[PDB]
Amino acid sequence: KIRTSPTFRRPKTLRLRRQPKYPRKSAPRRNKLDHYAIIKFPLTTESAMKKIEDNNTLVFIVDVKANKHQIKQAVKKLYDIDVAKVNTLIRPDGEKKAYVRLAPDYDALDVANKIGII
Amino acid sequence: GRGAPLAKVVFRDPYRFKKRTELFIAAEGIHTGQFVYCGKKAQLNIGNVLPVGTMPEGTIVCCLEEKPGDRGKLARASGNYATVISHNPETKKTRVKLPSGSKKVISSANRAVVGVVAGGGRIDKPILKAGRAYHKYKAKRNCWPRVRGVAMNP
Amino acid sequence: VVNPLFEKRPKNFGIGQDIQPKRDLTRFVKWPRYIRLQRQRAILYKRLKVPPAINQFTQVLDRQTATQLLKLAHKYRPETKQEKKQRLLARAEKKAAKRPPVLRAGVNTVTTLVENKKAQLVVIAHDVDPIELVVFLPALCRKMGVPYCILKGKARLCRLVHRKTCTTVAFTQVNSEDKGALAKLVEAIRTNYNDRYDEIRRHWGGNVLGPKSVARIAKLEKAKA
RNA sequence: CCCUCAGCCGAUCGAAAGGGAGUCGGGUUCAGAUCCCCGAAUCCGGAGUGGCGGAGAUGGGCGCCGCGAGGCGUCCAGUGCG
RNA sequence: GUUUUUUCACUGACCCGGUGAGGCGGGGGGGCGAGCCGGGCUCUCGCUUCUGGCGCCAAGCGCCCGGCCGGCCGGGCGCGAC
Asked: What is the role of this chain (chain C)?
């Protein structure tokens, strides 16, 4: 029992885990940025349809809170598709627009018809 | 902002495998690669630190402590020296003449580097140009262009 | 059998030579602010000129007698809070179908039976946290002719009862076969405390300088001889 | 968990000109490009039972079988070379 | 004794400086010089000045401590460092 330093450091006391008697909130918050909530509607513009037929990419207006990862999961789940990459820009309207390019197994123009944009 | 050169003196810690570096006020004759020896049993040549109780009368020292363990306060502007007058081995008080001419009594166990401070006689060359004065005081503080009171308003 | 590659290596731990070892620094530690407080509270109590009313609590009962006293005290305990219920189990055999001597605990209910001539021996703890609670009971017990002793540890005297601490503990009565043990206690305690009372009252404690201030005085004393 | 080990010594904020790894050429729009397209690279982070080579690292001294290679058992070295 | 009634100095409130609050004040086996005939004594030191190297996480000595099979492997504790 030898003090080799002229300093007194606070002894490392134990700190227990929480085992709470009741949960603060009754139910977990059901998620509101789901697949349908995240993809609002496709753009049907001159540009968008020109992008569809020339670059093999869809143009959606996307919920402003959403990541590229959440978009890429959503379109895959909502259209039975595969995505090369997603590129997002926030417009001067205060709404996101997500260019979802498809992997070459799927044609944008084949998918545009069945979702109902032409 | 200062006249005298400093000196980065590397000692080795007696207690752990560190190395300590202290900035000193350089005495005229300190060079790089020189050994300096600090404490009681250290010898009396220029650059060494030893208490003013353990050195003869007429020892020209500089960077002299005023209270024992305050790390040196008196005689540390460029080309200054606080010479030792006499001792009092009982009660342990040593007279020292200071750069002004004041002869103060100090507690005899307090340390000082031997020899006069480096960068001496630098108040001999004339500034000549207001620009040199500007460039001097710009390193120190906002004090230079002194407006004399008599020109100012009441 | 003696391997010639095993070699003795000396460490010269003199000034400016070798890195010093890991020795005990329990003396030069910068302690927390509370440890430093309670330590140089115990130093103040040795330097300062302490009055005999406070100081009289540092003349404490000896180890030999205190063991004999707590051996006697251990038979006349108050009942535990769980001991009380099995006495109420023993109610119904006449009800649904003469009280023993204990130690009178606390200061108020010992003070009221020192003034009343109802205490045969009064035990006081030496270490009451505010001392104003207990300062007077020496005077009371002496004046009213009650034999009293001062023990170390209110924690020890509170373990007689079934609580943490208890400042004062009195013997109001004992049984016929345990009369003799109380009799031989009061003899050696009443000769010790109650009869030395003109001596105790004029005896100032403390006023002892530090060991290196004493050792400087002793050097100055043998410097003129 | 509990044992052994730990100085920098000040939370936090402060630069779209300071510090700060790594993308460039051609084409493409009515309006955007070092960002889209085509084609060449590249920096950081990771890999679950570790995905492939190369490196460590395959000498030296023996003894039988042997036409010699070379094999078979033994006994020493090897955390790379000029 | 309890005040009153003057100079020297005491530490303990209070103040300043230092530091990662690291060796303070006594004594003591220990070492040089002081002195009586192995004996016990007052003081002085406490291990590094020839060079622009290297210096930590112990060497050595002493006592026990689980197995496996008084012979078969690695740990703790002092002095070292009063």
From this structure: Component of the large ribosomal subunit. The ribosome is a large ribonucleoprotein complex responsible for the synthesis of proteins in the cell.
